[PDB]
């Protein structure tokens, strides 16, 4: 149903919002959820493994069955599977981890993904463990994605920095 609501509108086409992206995704029941992946969408981590605990497992296994058959993806590159009792459609996006020397040229790539989709539930990419400077996360965001993106940023002080980035 799409009924996002408590967002900040930073373009015509991008939204913020301090919240938990599981959360938003109980409550707006999206078409899609974007996943914060790695190339083998092995989901144990941070943003990942929030949303396949969400959804009690069933994204690992079904990601399993997956790479088994198609090997794992690229850094930039994305996969379309099923959202599972979050989302109709998980869109796992691997952006580059620059904390282990992935190319940040790369995010503009992984950000690409965004506009075969009209609206998106996502977590800010390569931010966090993954050591992308976060406020040049959302200027990557924000020059390449032209669909409508609605980014769950959780952690206030991160949301501040970055609202507070975007209005200079
Ligand atoms: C309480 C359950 N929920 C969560 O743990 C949770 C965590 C959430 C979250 N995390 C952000 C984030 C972004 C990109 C990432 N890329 C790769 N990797 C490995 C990450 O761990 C990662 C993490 C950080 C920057 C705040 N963003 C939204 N919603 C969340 N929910």
Known sequence: V????????????????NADIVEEAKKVKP??????????????????????KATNNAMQVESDDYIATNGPLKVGGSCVLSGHNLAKHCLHVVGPNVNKGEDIQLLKSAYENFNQHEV???????????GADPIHSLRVCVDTVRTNVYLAVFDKNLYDKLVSSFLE
């Open 2 to 17: 799409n009924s996002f609501s408590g967002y900040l509108k930073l373009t015509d086409n991008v939204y913020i919002k």
């Open 31 to 52: 078409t899609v959820v974007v996943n914060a992946a790695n190339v083998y969408l092995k989901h144990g981590g941070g943003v990942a493994g929030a949303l396949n």
């Open 120 to 130: 998106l539930l996502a977590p800010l990419l390569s931010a966090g463990i993954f």
